[PDB]
Design a protein around this ligand. Structure first.
Ligand SMILES: Nc1ncnc2c1ncn2[C@@H]1O[C@H](COP(=O)(O)OP(=O)(O)O)[C@@H](O)[C@H]1O
Ligand SMILES: Nc1ncnc2c1ncn2[C@@H]1O[C@H](COP(=O)(O)OP(=O)(O)O)[C@@H](O)[C@H]1O
Lengths: 571, 519, 328
């Protein structure tokens, strides 16, 4: 109790506690005080605070606090418990027992700026998460048979010479009869967190550097990779010294990160006016052919045939049976043709317009730490509800072309590198893109576009080819569909003014209601076995007209779209 | 004197709160309160121009005879405009100062709050409204040496809007310390010698001081949080000291920029070489003052006041006020007026101007303080989008001399500048740049004119006016100057705004207007 | 030392002045003086709204001969450029040009791709056609979708591509093919060539000998010690855009020459065949600091297409000549 300065107590003595009990303005709302109450709505055992409210009281703690928070934040812990435990009952008549807590703080900086000077010090910076480990273990105390004292620890030595199997007369017991007894112990968490620097601070001629992090109790299970963070930590150490002389320890820990809310993407992890938006357009029975000029909302293609998408994104219905089979609710569609038609950028947009990945061939596609063989998996990762559209089928190795035959016609998945069998499946699908042989002159004739199999042309449906067909009338138009489309690089906003050819995000959630209600069906009702086996698109229209049911031949609208394809394999 | 008039104010009424100004709400919100204080219901006006005068009042052809005038009076022989007056009384507290004597007399329907030691304009009624022919004109013109020296040479503005109301009200058992802050709002609104002159500022070092250095109604126990009365200190009106780092002031400040030449490099080396003499760090010169470490933040002004004595900037010490409510802050009165203009947002909804007026009048409450933060934000970026034309201009030299003044034109609008008064600022930022600094002052001290691209309002060549600097008090010929080409030719001209120095031409009928106006 | 550039290096006379000092080796092949007068001179973001980021890359090659200068092809620009990254091709090219997201643990080192280093720089290449396809996978889509794809490792990561592609390859099966098509003149792929931009060719039939012996007797215009910072200015300063000036003309260059030059070798005409142009028609103002673009820079761009293209088509060679020399 050296009360001249640096006192051991003042904070928990009267001060920080009383600051808490002074954080008080009227309405009877201005509190740092009932916060934890509504934390106690569940037993959260934490609380958030600022770095510029102490300054609202003083100028003396701010500098004294930020220096040795390794002490102050546990002073604050003690203040917290010894204040809050008053609250379990006004007078002595309710308590199971107290418990443990947390306190959480809140100008940014970078990684290439902080060094030997910036040690034992609190900081604000911002980065981008990479990956990190699991949740293992840590305690605060336990004890030993030999003396049975709660093994008090400074920091989250090994019982020197005193044994305490000792006072039995003489008979002695040197050199540690200390069997650590964890049944008496305490317990904490861990994650060991991770960051990458910005894409703005010279990783180009140089290398992008980074460092490791360290967490404690409740702040794991909070953060996963592909996110963007702001933080406060400590520049602290793990090694010792005086390594040709003394090279040593980087890391940090956490105190109180603050993460980002980047705009409009993250309806991913953490309204009914929009339903009124949704439904009064579908009240109009003008969506089937209206949104045949929407899926390419700003450029030309598939125009009168884009109606055939209405079945696929909603899909049919994975109509299980009493018998064995789980039918092909997944169903596949095709494109194929030459470049120049905007076929590269169109599907580029389609990733923007549910969830997938997009490139073609060899570019997805068949650690030095804690001796566990990780395996991140296969191709249902982003596609089990997500579906894809990709080029270069034959333009790909044939080792990773068995899987497609297992993936696709059935999702007949399995594993054989080690000895265990992933029995995976998915509600997924693909489209194909192309630059294979000779296009429209090929499609009418026979069957050699792919130079290995007749299988393909097996379990696929509509054959809609991409061409740059000579049409002198349309030559000038697409000679003029292309300049200001490119030039001024301007086609952003005025596509959304359409009736229902609009509002990509609204469309995303239109759809993620539309299919996402139930397994609707149909009504009672050249016409071959495979073309037939389109019955799944008989099912489709009840999500397209949003019916329960429909009959055969009003939805043979698609047959007018498919007979276009049949000319390829007419005879 | 309205100790006799004010006590008449019990019947029906209107509280006009006149055309665009900060002065308005300052000197009215007081009384939007005081009306329900006397159990009076209040009624208010959005005004944008004399346009608004009778398209609003003409909707209200009644006789409600306890009536305001502020920011107008330089309008008409106000019975001739406001003819439905039979005995309908008006009450004037206008700052639109130089008024004609047509408007005071018929002394039933106006009240003369005019008393001054300048008795020079007496027979104007004995000249104009009274006027053998030859000698009549001899009087007419030889005394229009003084009369037309009024209202045909220049124009200016006077004194407060509710400091009169303060003078009424501190007697009435009312110590609304908040409303004294509101007074200071009105002070640095236009009494700032940086904007329009006080001079007697140095003797209002006594005035409100003696009001409140008098008064600590808790002289012994004043250590509480809410509504601690405000305190005088010698401080700055440098640009927005508080929430952004020093280097933002040192960049975006004019009284550096006029004297230190900062947009170029040697400004910066020289700056560093003074931050040597202060010995401040550079991180510390790039964190918000509220964000920095402390003893530097503490010892700032103590050193800056003195060892800035020697380096071409004499006039950074001023006298000002600043306070908070509790523990979140310490606001500054000067850290507000540049926030005020931020909701003066000239958006193309048609909703924006008036409703933002309601918003701003909702703003000066202690209860309504969240929004002000966004205003501060906007102001900073505005101040740095200033530069968006400055170096591109001052180095490209868009500058036009054009005779016995200096001439500028912008030809592309900004959503920043749809709101007009930017046109005053950039003039007052940049004439310094080249036309003052790369030369002697001989080519510096002349006023300047500023085009206004109207990319939204169909093209109408909006304008504002400017003085030479270091002799400001010599009133603006531009009060008249632009009537020249208007008087010579006249070309689609309007004076639709309250102000003299404001006009509206056609997009493409402006050059010959100039060649007329060159003289 | 700024009195040269601002008065001398923004004319179109500079395609003599700079061409005076472009390739101080011998007189030969005045085309590429124009070419390299353009080649370091571009790069643009202009990402559109709602679609993606579109395009700012250049993509070039010539098919040479053993005895030509397709080895000694590219040297001078190494020192000068704001960014330059050199690699001779396969023979010792590696695949490192396999990242499970397994950060390089202690004394464990594994490596990754150099494309982002000197992003907005170049890959300077001989033996381009020799390299390995699994490296070509990385090398391709930088130029197509402005991104590339690590393939089914722990991560399926990418690598940022705002950059340019140049090379100095060797022919196929010999020395050189005639006006007969160029896929068989040198054996690249097509869907890699779909993203390719610029061309020139070096054959020779029958001053120089006196030159070569004088140059073998060395007993022992632009300034040399600045000339980067001008090209910085051409890569920095002036950047206009425009609507269709008269390029609707190209609905003929599309339709007619799709169909007059119909069936010999006459596919390779596209909007990417002029997106290639679009990258450098603008660049005339990067050279000139124009702030606008007219048909002046068009016709010179067409003089480059007019001249590069005619070699890449069948020995029906006049198909370009009457058809476009009026636009020369
Ligand atoms: N009808 C069209 N509308 C818009 N752009 C088009 C059209 N036809 C071709 N294009 C152009 O084609 C380019 C894409 O060509 P791409 O499909 O990549 O060729 P390839 O399939 O051989 O790679 C786009 O940049 C686009 O500008
Ligand atoms: N048009 C030319 N201009 C200048 N030098 C030439 C030209 N043609 C051939 N040469 C000569 O060719 C020599 C280089 O031949 P080289 O490029 O090494 O053959 P390769 O490419 O198969 O290795 C040079 O030393 C140069 O003098």
């Amino acid at each position: 109790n050296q009360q001249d300065a640096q006192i051991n107590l003042q904070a928990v003595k009267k001060k920080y506690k009383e600051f808490i009990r002074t954080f008080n303005e009227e309405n009877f709302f201005y509190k740092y005080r009932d916060t934890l109450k509504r934390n106690y709505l569940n037993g959260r055992y934490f609380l958030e605070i600022e770095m510029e409210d102490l300054v609202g009281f003083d100028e003396t703690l701010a500098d004294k606090l930020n220096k040795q928070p390794t002490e102050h934040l546990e002073i604050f812990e003690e203040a917290a418990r010894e204040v809050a435990d008053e609250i379990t009952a006004p007078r002595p008549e309710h308590e199971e027992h107290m418990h443990d807590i947390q306190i959480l703080l809140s100008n940014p900086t970078n990684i290439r700026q902080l060094k030997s000077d910036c040690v034992s010090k609190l900081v604000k910076i911002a980065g981008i998460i990479v990956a990190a480990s699991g949740i293992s273990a840590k305690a605060t105390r336990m004890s030993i048979q030999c003396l049975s004292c709660s093994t008090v620890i400074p920091n989250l030595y090994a019982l020197p010479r005193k044994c305490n199997t000792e006072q039995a007369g003489r008979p002695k017991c040197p050199l540690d009869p200390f069997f650590i007894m964890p049944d008496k112990c305490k317990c904490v968490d861990f994650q060991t967190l991770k960051l990458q620097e910005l894409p703005d601070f010279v990783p180009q001629g140089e290398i992008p550097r980074h460092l490791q992090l360290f967490c404690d109790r409740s702040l794991c299970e909070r953060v996963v990779p592909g996110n963007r963070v702001l933080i406060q930590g400590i520049y602290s150490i793990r090694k010792v010294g005086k390594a040709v002389v003394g090279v040593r320890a980087p890391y940090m820990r956490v105190v109180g990160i603050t993460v980002d809310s980047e705009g409009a993407g993250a309806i991913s992890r953490y309204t009914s006016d929009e339903e009124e938006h949704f439904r009064r357009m579908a009240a109009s029975g003008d969506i089937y052919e209206r949104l045949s000029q929407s899926l390419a909302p700003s450029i030309f293609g598939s125009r009168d045939i884009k109606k055939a998408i209405t079945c696929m994104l909603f899909g049919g219905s994975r109509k299980r049976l009493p018998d064995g089979l789980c039918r092909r609710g997944d169903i596949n569609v095709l494109l194929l043709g030459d470049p120049g038609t905007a076929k590269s950028q169109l599907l580029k947009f389609v990733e923007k317009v549910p969830i997938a990945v997009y490139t073609s061939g060899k570019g997805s596609s068949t650690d030095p730490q804690t001796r566990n063989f990780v395996m991140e998996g296969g191709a249902m990762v982003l596609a089990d509800g997500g579906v894809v559209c990709i080029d270069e089928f034959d333009k790909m190795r044939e080792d990773d072309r068995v899987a497609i035959h297992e993936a696709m016609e059935q999702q007949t998945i399995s594993i054989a590198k080690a000895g265990i069998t992933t029995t995976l499946n998915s509600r997924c699908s693909v489209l194909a893109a192309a630059n294979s042989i000779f296009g429209r002159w090929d499609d009418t004739k026979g069957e050699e576009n792919i130079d290995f199999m007749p299988t393909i042309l097996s379990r696929f449906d509509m054959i809609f080819i991409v061409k740059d067909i000579h049409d002198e009338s349309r030559d000038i138009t697409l000679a003029k569909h292309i300049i200001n489309v490119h030039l001024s690089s301007n086609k952003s906003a005025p596509s959304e003014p359409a009736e229902g050819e609009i509002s990509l995000s609204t469309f995303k959630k239109y759809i993620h209601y539309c299919r996402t209600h139930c397994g609707p069906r149909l009504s009672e009702a050249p016409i071959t076995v495979r073309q037939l086996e389109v019955i799944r698109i008989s099912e489709s229209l009840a999500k397209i007209r949003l019916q329960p049911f429909a009959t055969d031949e009003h939805v043979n609208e698609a047959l007018r779209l498919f007979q276009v394809s049949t000319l390829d394999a007419a005879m | 004197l309205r100790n006799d008039f004010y006590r008449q104010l019990v019947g029906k009424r209107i509280l006009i709160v006149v055309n665009y100004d900060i002065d308005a709400i300052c000197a009215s919100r007081i009384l939007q309160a005081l009306f329900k204080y006397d159990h009076m219901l209040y009624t208010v006006v959005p005004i944008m121009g004399v346009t608004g005068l009778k398209r609003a009042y003409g909707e209200h052809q009644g006789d409600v005879k306890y009536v305001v005038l502020v920011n107008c009076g330089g309008c008409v022989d106000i019975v001739e405009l406001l003819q439905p007056s039979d005995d309908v009384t008006f009450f004037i507290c206008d700052s639109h100062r130089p008024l004609d004597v047509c408007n005071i007399y018929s002394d039933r329907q106006v009240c003369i709050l005019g008393d001054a030691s300048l008795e020079e304009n007496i027979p104007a009624f004995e000249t104009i409204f009274y006027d053998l022919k030859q000698r009549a004109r001899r009087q007419w013109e030889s005394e229009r040496d003084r009369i037309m020296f009024e209202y045909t040479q220049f124009s200016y503005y006077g004194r407060s809007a509710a400091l009169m109301v303060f003078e009424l009200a501190w007697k009435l058992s009312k110590d609304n310390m908040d409303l004294l802050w509101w007074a200071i709002v009105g002070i640095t609104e236009q009494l700032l010698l940086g904007k329009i002159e006080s001079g007697a500022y140095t003797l209002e070092l006594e005035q409100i001081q003696s009001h409140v250095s008098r008064l600590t109604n808790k002289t012994n126990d004043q250590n509480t949080m809410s509504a601690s009365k405000i305190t005088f200190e010698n401080d700055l009106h440098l640009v927005l000291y508080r929430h952004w780092p020093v280097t933002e002031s040192m960049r975006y400040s004019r009284y550096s920029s006029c004297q230190l030449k900062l947009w170029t490099l040697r400004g910066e080396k020289r700056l560093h070489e003074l931050l040597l003499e202060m010995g401040l760090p550079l991180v510390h010169a790039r964190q918000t003052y509220g964000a920095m470490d402390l003893v530097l933040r503490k010892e700032f002004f103590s050193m800056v006041e003195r060892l800035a004595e020697k380096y071409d900037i004499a006039d950074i010490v001023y006298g000002t006020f600043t306070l908070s409510y509790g523990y979140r802050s310490r606001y500054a009165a000067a850290d507000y007026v540049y926030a005020l203009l931020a909701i003066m947002e000239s958006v193309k909804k048609h909703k924006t101007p008036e409703d933002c007026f309601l918003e701003a009048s909702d703003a000066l409450s202690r209860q309504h303080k969240q929004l002000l933060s966004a205003g501060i934000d906007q102001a900073k970026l505005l101040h740095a989008a200033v530069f968006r034309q400055v170096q591109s201009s001052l180095e490209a030299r868009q500058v036009h001399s054009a005779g016995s003044f200096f001439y500028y034109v912008l030809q592309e609008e900004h959503a920043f500048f749809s709101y007009p008064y930017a046109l005053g600022l950039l003039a007052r930022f940049l004439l310094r740049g080249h036309v003052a600094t790369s030369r002697a002052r001989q080519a510096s001290d002349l006023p300047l004119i500023a085009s206004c691209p109207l990319n939204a309002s169909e093209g109408m060549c909006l304008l504002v006016g400017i003085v030479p600097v270091r002799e400001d008090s010599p009133r603006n010929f531009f009060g008249k100057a632009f009537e020249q080409a208007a008087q010579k030719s006249g070309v689609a001209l309007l004076q639709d705004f309250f102000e003299p120095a404001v006009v509206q031409l056609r997009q493409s009928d402006l050059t010959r207007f100039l060649d007329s106006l060159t003289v | 030392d700024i009195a040269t550039i601002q008065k001398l290096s923004k004319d179109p006379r500079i395609v003599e002045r700079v061409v005076a000092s472009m390739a101080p080796s011998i007189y030969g092949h005045d085309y590429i003086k124009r070419a390299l007068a353009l080649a370091l001179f571009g790069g643009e973001s202009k990402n559109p709204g709602e679609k993606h980021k579109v395009r700012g890359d250049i993509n070039l090659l010539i098919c040479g001969d053993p005895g030509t200068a397709k080895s000694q092809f590219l040297k001078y620009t190494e020192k000068v450029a704001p960014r330059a990254v050199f690699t001779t091709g396969q023979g010792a090219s590696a695949v490192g040009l396999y990242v499970r997201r397994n950060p390089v643990s202690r004394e464990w080192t594994l490596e990754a791709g150099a494309l982002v280093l000197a992003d907005q720089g170049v890959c300077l290449i001989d033996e381009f056609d020799k390299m390995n396809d699994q490296d070509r996978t990385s090398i391709h889509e930088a130029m197509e979708q402005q991104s590339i794809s690590i393939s089914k490792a722990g991560i399926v990561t990418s690598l940022q591509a705002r950059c340019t592609v140049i090379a100095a390859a060797n022919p196929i099966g010999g020395r050189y093919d005639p006006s007969m098509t160029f896929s068989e003149n040198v054996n690249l792929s097509e869907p890699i060539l779909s993203r390719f931009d610029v061309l020139c060719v070096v054959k020779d039939e029958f001053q120089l000998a006196k030159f070569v012996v004088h140059s073998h007797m060395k007993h022992h215009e632009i300034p040399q010690d600045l000339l980067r910072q001008y090209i910085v200015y051409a890569k920095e300063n002036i950047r206009p855009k425009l609507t269709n000036i008269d390029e609707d003309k190209i609905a003929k260059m599309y339709a007619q020459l799709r169909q007059e030059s119909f069936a010999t070798g006459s596919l390779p005409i596209t909007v990417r065949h002029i997106e290639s142009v679009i990258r450098m028609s603008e660049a005339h103002a990067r050279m000139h600091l124009r702030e606008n673009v007219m048909e002046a820079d068009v016709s010179m761009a067409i003089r480059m297409m007019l001249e590069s293209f005619i070699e890449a088509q069948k020995f029906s060679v006049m198909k370009k000549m009457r058809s476009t020399f009026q636009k020369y």
